[PDB]
Structure 1
Amino acid sequence: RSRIFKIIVIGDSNVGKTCLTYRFCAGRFPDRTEATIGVDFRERAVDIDGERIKIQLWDTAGQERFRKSMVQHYYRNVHAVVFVYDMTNMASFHSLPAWIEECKQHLLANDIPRILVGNKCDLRSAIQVPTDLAQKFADTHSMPLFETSAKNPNDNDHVEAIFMTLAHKLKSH
C-alpha cells in the first residue's frame, strides 16, 4: 500500500501538456507527440521522506469539444491540478478562467493544490504573455506560477523541481 495521488493536467490544445507530463514521468521530452485523444494515463512513484507515494497523471485532450463532452467525469477524486498555457499564445492564457470555472462546477473540493505552468519559454521572441500578467492571474486564484520549457534541455532539472513542488505539497496532507 502506497498512497496514490491523482493529478490532472488541463489547458488548451498544443500548449504542451503531453510534453510536460512526459517530463514529470520520464525526465525526457517526447519530440513526436500525437494529438492526445481522451485522457492519457501515466504513473510515477515518488519517495519522499521514507514514504513511497504514487502519482497518477491524467494528461487531457484540450480541444473544446472534448472539454464539454467528458473531461468533466475525469474530475472525480483528483488530488491536484496543473493548469497549462503556452507562453507564446495569449489566447491559450485567456482560456484559463474557463478551465478554472470548469474545475469548480464539475468537482467537490477547493483546498486542493494547483499550479499554473506557462510553457514554451524557449520561444523567447514569440512570448506574448508577460510574467507580471500571469502572476497577477495566479495570485487572484491563489496558486503558484512557473514559467518554463518542457523542450529546453537547460530547463529539465527545473521542470523536475516544479513537479517535486507539488509532490511535496501532496505528501504533507
Structure 2
Amino acid sequence: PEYDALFKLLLIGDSGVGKSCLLLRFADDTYTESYISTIGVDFKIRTIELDGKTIKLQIWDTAGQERFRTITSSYYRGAHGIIVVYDVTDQESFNNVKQWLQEIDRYASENVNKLLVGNKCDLTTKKVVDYTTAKEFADSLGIPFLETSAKNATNVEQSFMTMAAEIKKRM
C-alpha cells in the first residue's frame, strides 16, 4: 500500500442530477452524453495528493430512482464521505435533498463528512435554485456547499479536493 490514505466516498441524489458526469470529469477529466443511465452500483478510483501525502479515493456511483434506495444502502456504511448532488435547474431535486440527508443518517456513520453540490449551473437560462437559498440550507447544517458544472469542469475538482481535506482533517 504505497498510499497514505484510502477514502471511501459516495454520490447520492435524484436521477439525472449529474452524479456520474461529475465522477467522470473528476476521474478521467472528460464529459460526454453517451454513457446512458446507471442501473445499480458502480465505482471509480482516483489518487490525489494533499499536504504532500497520497490519498487513494474510491468514489461510488448509484441510481437516483427511489426504488434503488434499499439496495443502495448497503454501500452507505463504510463511507468516509457522502456528496449529495442536486440539479440547479430542477426544483424537485433540491426539495428532496431533505430525504437524501435523512437517508445518510439511517445507514452511514454519524462521524461522516457531508458536502452538498448544485450541478448543471452552466445552464444559467434554466437555473431555478438560488445560490443563496441553498447556501442557506447548507450552512444551517454545517455542510460545505458548492456550485458545479461537470460540463465545464466548474468546481468539480474542488468539490472532491474539499471532501478529501474534510476527511483528512480527522484521521
- C-alpha distance after superposition, 1:68-91 (max 9, x if no partner): x21111112100010000000000
Provide structure 2 residue ranges, at least 5 long, that are not aligned to the other structure.
none
Q: Within 5 A, what are the aligned runs for 1:150-169? A: 150-152=150-152, 155=154, 158-169=155-166
Q: Distance in 2 between matches of 1:163 and 1:30?
A: 20
Q: Which residue of 1 aligns with 2:61?
A: 59
The TM-score, its normalising length taken from structure 1, stands at 0.91
Partner of 1:128: 128
CA distance in structure 2 between the aligned counterparts of 1:8 and 1:65, rounded to whole angstroms:
18
Q: CA deviation at 1:170?
A: 2.1
For residue 16 of structure 1, report the CA deviation from its aligned partner. 0.2
Cα contact 1:120–1:149 (8 A) shared by 2:
yes
What is the aligned partner in structure 2 of residue 140 from structure 1? 140
Shift of 1:37: 1.0
SS at 1:56's partner residue? strand
RMSD after superposition: 1.3
Q: Which amino acid aligns with 1:4?
A: L
Give 2:25's aligned residue: 23
Per the alignment, residue 90 of structure 2 pairs with 89
Shift of 1:9: 0.3
**In 2, distance between residues paired with 1:71 and 1:6?**
15
State the SS of the aligned residue for 2:45: strand
Where in structure 2 are the equivalents of 1:109-120 lying within 5 Å?
A: 109-120=109-120
Report the Cα offset of residue 55 of structure 1: 0.4
In structure 2, the residue matched to 1:6 is 8
Q: What is residue 38 of structure 1 aligned with on the other side?
A: 40
Task: Give a deviation string over 1:80-134, Cα, whole Å, max 9, x none.
Answer: 0100000000000011111111110123x22322110000011111111111111
Tell me the distance in 2 between the aligned counterparts of 1:9 and 1:24: 12
* Alpha-carbon offset, residue 32 of structure 1: 1.5
Q: How far 1:58 sits from its partner (Å)?
A: 0.3
- Aligned partner of 1:138: which letter? A
Alpha-carbon offset, residue 50 of structure 1 = 2.9
Structure 1 distance, partners of 2:33, 2:140, is: 34
In percent, how many aligned pairs have the same letter? 44
Name the one with the larger helix percent: 1
State the TM-score, normalized to the length of structure 2: 0.92
